[PDB]
Amino acid sequence: RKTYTLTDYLKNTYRLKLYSLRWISDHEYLYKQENNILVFNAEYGNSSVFLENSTFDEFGHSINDYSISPDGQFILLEYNYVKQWRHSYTASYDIYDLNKRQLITEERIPNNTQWVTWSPVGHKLAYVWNNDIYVKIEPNLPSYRITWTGKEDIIYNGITDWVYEEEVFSAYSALWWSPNGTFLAYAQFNDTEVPLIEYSFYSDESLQYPKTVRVPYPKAGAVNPTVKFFVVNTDSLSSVTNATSIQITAPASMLIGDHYLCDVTWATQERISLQWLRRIQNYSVMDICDYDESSGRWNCLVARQHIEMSTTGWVGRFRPSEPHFTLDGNSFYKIISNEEGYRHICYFQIDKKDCTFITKGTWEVIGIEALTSDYLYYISNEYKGMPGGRNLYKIQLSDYTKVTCLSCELNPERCQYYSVSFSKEAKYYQLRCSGPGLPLYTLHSSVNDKGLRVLEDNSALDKMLQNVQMPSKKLDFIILNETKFWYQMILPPHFDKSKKYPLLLDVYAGPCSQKADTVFRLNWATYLASTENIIVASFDGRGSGYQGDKIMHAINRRLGTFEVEDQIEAARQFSKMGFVDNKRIAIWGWSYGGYVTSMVLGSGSGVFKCGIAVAPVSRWEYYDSVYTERYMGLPTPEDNLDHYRNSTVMSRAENFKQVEYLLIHGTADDNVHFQQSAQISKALVDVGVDFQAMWYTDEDHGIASSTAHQHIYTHMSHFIKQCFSLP
Amino acid sequence: RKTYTLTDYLKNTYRLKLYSLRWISDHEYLYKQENNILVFNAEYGNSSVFLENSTFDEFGHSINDYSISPDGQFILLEYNYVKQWRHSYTASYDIYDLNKRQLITEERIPNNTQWVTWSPVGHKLAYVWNNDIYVKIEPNLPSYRITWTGKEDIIYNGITDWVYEEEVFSAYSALWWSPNGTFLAYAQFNDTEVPLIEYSFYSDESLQYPKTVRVPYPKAGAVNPTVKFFVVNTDSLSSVTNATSIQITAPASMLIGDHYLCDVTWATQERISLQWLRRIQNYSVMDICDYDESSGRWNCLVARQHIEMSTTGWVGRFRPSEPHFTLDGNSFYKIISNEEGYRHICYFQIDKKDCTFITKGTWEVIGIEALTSDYLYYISNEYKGMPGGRNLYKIQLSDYTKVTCLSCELNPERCQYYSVSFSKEAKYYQLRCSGPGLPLYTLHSSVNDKGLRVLEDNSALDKMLQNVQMPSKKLDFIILNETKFWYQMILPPHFDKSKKYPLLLDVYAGPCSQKADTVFRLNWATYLASTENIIVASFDGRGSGYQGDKIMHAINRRLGTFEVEDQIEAARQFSKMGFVDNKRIAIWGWSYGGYVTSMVLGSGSGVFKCGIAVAPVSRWEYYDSVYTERYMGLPTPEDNLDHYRNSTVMSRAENFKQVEYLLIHGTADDNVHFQQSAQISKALVDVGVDFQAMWYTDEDHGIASSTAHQHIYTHMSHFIKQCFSLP
Numbered sequence A, B: 001r002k003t004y005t006l007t008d009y010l011k012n013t014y015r016l017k018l019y020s021l022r023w024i025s026d027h028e029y030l031y032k033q034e035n036n037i038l039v040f041n042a043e044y045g046n047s048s049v050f051l052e053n054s055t056f057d058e059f060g061h062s063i064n065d066y067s068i069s070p071d072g073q074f075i076l077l078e079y080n081y082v083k084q085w086r087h088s089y090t091a092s093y094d095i096y097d098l099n100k101r102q103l104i105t106e107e108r109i110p111n112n113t114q115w116v117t118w119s120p121v122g123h124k125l126a127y128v129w130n131n132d133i134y135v136k137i138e139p140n141l142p143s144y145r146i147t148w149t150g151k152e153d154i155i156y157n158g159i160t161d162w163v164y165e166e167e168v169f170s171a172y173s174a175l176w177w178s179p180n181g182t183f184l185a186y187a188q189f190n191d192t193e194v195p196l197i198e199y200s201f202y203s204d205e206s207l208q209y210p211k212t213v214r215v216p217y218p219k220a221g222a223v224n225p226t227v228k229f230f231v232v233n234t235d236s237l238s239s240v241t242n243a244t245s246i247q248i249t250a251p252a253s254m255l256i257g258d259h260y261l262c263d264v265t266w267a268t269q270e271r272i273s274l275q276w277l278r279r280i281q282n283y284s285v286m287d288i289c290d291y292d293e294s295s296g297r298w299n300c301l302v303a304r305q306h307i308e309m310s311t312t313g314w315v316g317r318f319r320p321s322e323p324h325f326t327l328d329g330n331s332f333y334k335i336i337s338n339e340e341g342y343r344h345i346c347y348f349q350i351d352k353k354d355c356t357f358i359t360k361g362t363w364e365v366i367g368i369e370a371l372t373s374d375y376l377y378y379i380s381n382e383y384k385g386m387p388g389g390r391n392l393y394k395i396q397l398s399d400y401t402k403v404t405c406l407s408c409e410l411n412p413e414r415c416q417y418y419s420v421s422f423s424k425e426a427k428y429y430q431l432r433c434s435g436p437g438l439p440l441y442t443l444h445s446s447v448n449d450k451g452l453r454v455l456e457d458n459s460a461l462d463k464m465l466q467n468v469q470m471p472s473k474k475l476d477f478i479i480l481n482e483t484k485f486w487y488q489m490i491l492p493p494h495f496d497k498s499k500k501y502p503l504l505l506d507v508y509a510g511p512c513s514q515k516a517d518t519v520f521r522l523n524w525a526t527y528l529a530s531t532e533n534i535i536v537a538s539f540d541g542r543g544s545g546y547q548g549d550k551i552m553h554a555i556n557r558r559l560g561t562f563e564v565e566d567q568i569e570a571a572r573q574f575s576k577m578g579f580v581d582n583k584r585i586a587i588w589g590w591s592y593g594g595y596v597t598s599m600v601l602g603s604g605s606g607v608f609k610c611g612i613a614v615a616p617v618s619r620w621e622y623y624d625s626v627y628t629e630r631y632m633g634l635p636t637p638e639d640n641l642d643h644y645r646n647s648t649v650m651s652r653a654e655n656f657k658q659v660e661y662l663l664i665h666g667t668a669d670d671n672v673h674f675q676q677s678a679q680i681s682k683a684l685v686d687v688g689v690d691f692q693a694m695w696y697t698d699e700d701h702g703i704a705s706s707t708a709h710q711h712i713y714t715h716m717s718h719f720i721k722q723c724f725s726l727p
């Protein structure tokens, strides 16, 4: 009988099916099938072919992706796609007129465009090229240039610099249409005095001299980019006169020093919400800015600011939370940490003090998913007090005591982890179950929360998997210091608690992380358990999220401490359970996981025979400002420098003579710079410790090229097997 | 007895003693002993403390080296030494007045000085600072600036650029004083359009942003530096006027294209000898330039030019040979390949054509060591027909047939490999034997070649070794197509020819190499054999040197062919022998030996179980122009592009599936760039080949920092032990 093998993982023998749909109104969505784009009707479920797979057979370009305008009239073809960072890329674009059934060859969008976006209604375009913003009112018309200051690596108009892309917006885009399509609001980043990270890129053999890449990248404590915010009136664009961009300045309480622009949210046609964050991330201000027909300006009455401070930690999970505005724009809801340090939905009224908590309890709201005049819909982990579960809920605005679980009972044994996607106005929603069973995609009508139809049930995979000796997953908790800390175990098939198993501790452990959940996954761990009979465990210790601030904030200004400790204690706890061979306990982790793995291996606890660290952080000054300073403050004598210095991997090099260690890193890693591992190895060498290593030429933090991905997991499997004396 | 362990090797428990002396005249030499600098009288052996170690105890800095003026009145104190490349470095200098017995304290030699040399007689000084040349007639007086054009990385006056340092002069210095001390000849290098190799330097843990190092470095086929030659009259310096330099122009036959300046030899007070080499190293011209007392010009009669060509390969072993001029500078002797392709001594007379061979036979002269009116002294490998042996000979200038060997029989069992050092005018000579027994330094008088005394017999080290089971060395040969090819084997103690032993093949194998010889080494192989009972073998196949052009030139324009092939065939030959476990055969090599080890490992021969390659070349376009083009020509379609592309390691990646490979490279390698290995590993990952790797943070080609050195051999030893299943 067979098992889930390494080749299965690497080669994708058993594929998860999905159902990715694009709502295009209050009752229809688009859906790709045989590369035919179909349009569906939510209420009745009937469909027709919106775009035939054949339409562009004569395009003479492989088509990367497509974007239909809000009004159906036009579709954007994305080709020549070249990836930059986690979100950024370049591409060439073409516009196809749907009514005329024709490619547009007039006033085309330039190659090497950095970003493109339809207006939210109609068919207007905004795009960025050479760091400047252009606007096309109609596809076949000359575009209007909005900014002239754009300049590679120095001035970014309408797009983010490296650190804004990665740590702040989670996007390349830095443009925001008003609901109307009347205003285009945008940010400008100035990286003039941001230092450059520099590394070699070797490329194809034929390249004689290696390239040096140079990326403005503020390390902890370094000079940060600066930011401005502008709003342009798209209706009044001259062909003679330049576009008059109106600037909105950050509150004076932010201007006093370094700060970030961290959220942009149109409330109405004439109200924009701006959240700003001090470089010290325990203080942020939400501005409410109104447009003035008479002056054409925008004013943010100081009196109506909204202020957030934290004292236990930083602000928000990873950032101040997103505001969700009631349609009229005079109030909003947003997730806020209550007085017991739990994250719950708060109701805010413009021009009124405080806010009002509409939810409470020892559990947390994960997200606000939709808002109607009667209901607010959110995801939380309240069901069964499982912090690693997700369920959809709705709360009646006219009586907060009335909360209905929409997903809890749909199928209580297969589905414990949901995400949701609502139609415009939310007449329908698509529920997406991620586990613990096979993923299940279903459609529902809001009116009386009625199941309409099943979209995808992964029955095809279920069948295949029935023929395989698959692992099972235990999700549970242990109690330390009278506190529940949750963990999971992927257990080998025909598990026998009277046998001894080798145990590999799979670690991430970064602030607000969660490695114990109810999600179904087919990954490297599946293979280790199925084929090699290894228990793969993870554990959520202090620092972990979704369980309140008392736990999440335990790591405030003290990274590489409690979260490192707790991993070690959890492994102590796992052995005491009678089915673990304490002579064979390993540990591995990527990114922040590689750091923690390293710190543990270097702790000298003698609990771990061996471990692997992939692209780990080695010391916090090496990593980016926005992320690092959030948890560690500044590395100055007046601030937290002492703990910056007491928390390096290097400083533990001696203890590595107790373990077998494998360090791996990509040479073109723009994120966790190869530097971080280069310093780890030099410290190990300098102190006489043997270890194993592997670099990946031209791979970034993802090491995700098809060949490298395969190569690394093959390399690590060999290492773990050796370590465990496995055949 | 105990064994010779890895620790002994790395800790240098068994030290070889040396006797390094400097001839200061025809009959005295300087010798440093316990940091006391002594003068010695050669005839009688008596001595004097020229300078007590106590002398600079309050100096204030650690003194790195010292240089005593020829006339013994001054001594340079070199301190603050920072290493650059193989030969180059900067340092600070103080001068100490022997008479006055004090430190000159004004008009000091600047900090960050690049080269200093005393004139050949007296106490003038030449030095280089910020790429410009300066001269001091007296240590206390202010210097005169000879050149004003110096610019970092661009204009080099009196010092070499990277590639000239490494491949041409084997020195940083480009300064030549006339024997007199009147003239100062210097070269000037222009690297204006030479491409720069760029790589990261990580530095200490505290450096936040890696530094990027940038070095002008011509890769094969790229733009080479250009070169100019100048001579200044050091006597007529003016404190008011800029000093005037006379340029010596390369011959017309060199100026037609790219060329090098490869040799500068003063022949008399007023005759200078310049050798030039075409970028195609097929062709060289020696110029003889005479000083015109009136013209104040230097002239090179075309009629005097001596032209050296080759149709078989390149010119010289690694470069045109150096000329040795007779007293009057009217004639000279030079090593030259004869009609049978053997390298022998040739006698030239200025203003006459062609030349006369004064030695011949199927062996080769290695170097001309001293010249008198009665005899010419030289080192050759004639004795007992052994190519790996070395002996001092003299040949009677009035009868070439009368050639007497001066060392062959001193101690024929202990000594078969000698180098030599003569006093001025060759009155005395020091002999330095290096094997196959322990090194032995003797002193001798030329008048009747009588032995005067033993300087160092290594009796201490002999004693220590009595308590150690040392390996032994076999030096034999084998036949490949009716031709002899030499090899050596470090054999374990108590070698039993009935048993099977694993065998590690130690390879360099570059053009004109020799790894089979009679010298005594305490090294890694010594450990492998003594302790782990491994046979380490080296083999000199085609392309190896000192056996004539037929062999050395076999590889011309075809690196990575016969020499790779022949290493393999030697392995097979060894498998034939009945004390070799043909299932346990490894291979390893550094630098060129790394390239070869890789090409062999990817041959698919099946002969080798595993191998290690340390900072190997992978593609010839990645290495430097002077060295690569010497054997490969240019990487153009016109010239040798096809073989450049057919000789890469990357193209063999698939066959590595058949072997265990370990690939090691220092990240700061300025010589064989990390690039080279970066391109190997990528090709290996692209095709699913698993292998082992290790990078050395901030180490260069030498990987010689004490800790890294200890680390690389510890890692490699684990690998080899593992591959041979040794406990």
Ligand SMILES: *[C@@H]1O[C@H](CO)[C@@H](O[C@@H]2O[C@H](CO)[C@@H](O)[C@H](O)[C@H]2NC(C)=O)[C@H](O)[C@H]1NC(C)=O
Pocket (backbone or CB within 6 Å): A149, A155, A190, A191, A192, A193
């Ligand atoms: C981006 O920031 C840079 C750096 O501050 C600005 O350059 C400065 O501009 C001022 C005022 O024009 C000059 O007096 C300074 O000399 C400049 N300093 C530096 C470091 O260059 C630049 O103006 C900003 N660019 C934009 C368009 O916002």
Ligand SMILES: *[C@@H]1O[C@H](CO)[C@@H](O[C@@H]2O[C@H](CO)[C@@H](O)[C@H](O)[C@H]2NC(C)=O)[C@H](O)[C@H]1NC(C)=O
Pocket (backbone or CB within 6 Å): B149, B155, B190, B191, B192, B193
């Ligand atoms: C070093 O070589 C460079 C490149 O040939 C010389 O630069 C040229 O020199 C003259 C004027 O200086 C003109 O041909 C060009 O303006 C220069 N071209 C380039 C590429 O710069 C330079 O003069 C040389 N320097 C010395 C001291 O010889």
Ligand SMILES: COC(=O)CN1Cc2c(nc(C)c(CN)c2-c2ccc(Cl)cc2Cl)C1=O
Pocket (backbone or CB within 6 Å): A166, A167, A508, A510, A591, A592, A617, A623, A627, A671, A672, A701
């Ligand atoms: C469970 O696995 C993961 O969470 C993988 N990661 C790591 C990760 C991801 N996303 C963002 C935005 C960030 C912040 N830089 C990170 C991240 C976090 C810590 C370090 Cl030290 C490095 C990195 Cl890059 C992501 O997807």
Ligand SMILES: COC(=O)CN1Cc2c(nc(C)c(CN)c2-c2ccc(Cl)cc2Cl)C1=O
Pocket (backbone or CB within 6 Å): B166, B167, B508, B510, B591, B592, B617, B623, B627, B671, B672, B701
């Ligand atoms: C037996 O050990 C050795 O031969 C060690 N080497 C290698 C070496 C040495 N010297 C010079 C001048 C050179 C020319 N660049 C080299 C060399 C030769 C070929 C390559 Cl591919 C790389 C290199 Cl660096 C030296 O001492």
Ligand SMILES: *[C@@H]1O[C@H](CO)[C@@H](O)[C@H](O)[C@H]1NC(C)=O
Pocket (backbone or CB within 6 Å): A039, A040, A041, A044, A046, A047, A048
């Ligand atoms: C669904 O059916 C109705 C009635 O036939 C039709 O009007 C509508 O266009 C159909 N929708 C799709 C998406 O095919």
Ligand SMILES: *[C@@H]1O[C@H](CO)[C@@H](O)[C@H](O)[C@H]1NC(C)=O
Pocket (backbone or CB within 6 Å): A092, A108, A109, A110, A111
């Ligand atoms: C994009 O580049 C291609 C390649 O030459 C060119 O043919 C095309 O015209 C460019 N597209 C636009 C809109 O400039």
Ligand SMILES: *[C@@H]1O[C@H](CO)[C@@H](O)[C@H](O)[C@H]1NC(C)=O
Pocket (backbone or CB within 6 Å): A180, A181, A182, A269, A270, A291
């Ligand atoms: C959108 O809102 C703005 C707000 O002033 C208004 O001027 C404009 O008329 C609106 N656009 C449309 C399409 O009506």
Ligand SMILES: *[C@@H]1O[C@H](CO)[C@@H](O)[C@H](O)[C@H]1NC(C)=O
Pocket (backbone or CB within 6 Å): A480, A481, A565, A566
């Ligand atoms: C529990 O408390 C003890 C203090 O007695 C501490 O050492 C340990 O780290 C704590 N563990 C957890 C998980 O909080």
Ligand SMILES: *[C@@H]1O[C@H](CO)[C@@H](O)[C@H](O)[C@H]1NC(C)=O
Pocket (backbone or CB within 6 Å): B034, B035, B036, B053, B054
């Ligand atoms: C200096 O010289 C004396 C012998 O004259 C010697 O005994 C002493 O140890 C030396 N000091 C050193 C080695 O620095």
Ligand SMILES: *[C@@H]1O[C@H](CO)[C@@H](O)[C@H](O)[C@H]1NC(C)=O
Pocket (backbone or CB within 6 Å): B028, B039, B040, B041, B044, B046, B047, B048
């Ligand atoms: C050696 O001895 C002789 C005789 O006294 C003396 O003249 C000479 O200076 C001595 N040489 C040295 C180097 O001390």
Ligand SMILES: *[C@@H]1O[C@H](CO)[C@@H](O)[C@H](O)[C@H]1NC(C)=O
Pocket (backbone or CB within 6 Å): B092, B108, B109, B110, B111
């Ligand atoms: C070199 O600098 C050192 C101190 O760094 C100082 O002793 C000296 O003055 C300098 N030397 C000269 C002559 O420039």
Ligand SMILES: *[C@@H]1O[C@H](CO)[C@@H](O)[C@H](O)[C@H]1NC(C)=O
Pocket (backbone or CB within 6 Å): B180, B181, B182, B269, B270
């Ligand atoms: C050295 O030789 C040069 C060239 O002939 C001459 O000008 C000078 O006088 C000589 N100096 C000495 C040391 O006699």
Ligand SMILES: *[C@@H]1O[C@H](CO)[C@@H](O)[C@H](O)[C@H]1NC(C)=O
Pocket (backbone or CB within 6 Å): B480, B481, B565, B566
């Ligand atoms: C000997 O000759 C054979 C036949 O050409 C050839 O394959 C081999 O490479 C040669 N070996 C040597 C070492 O010359």
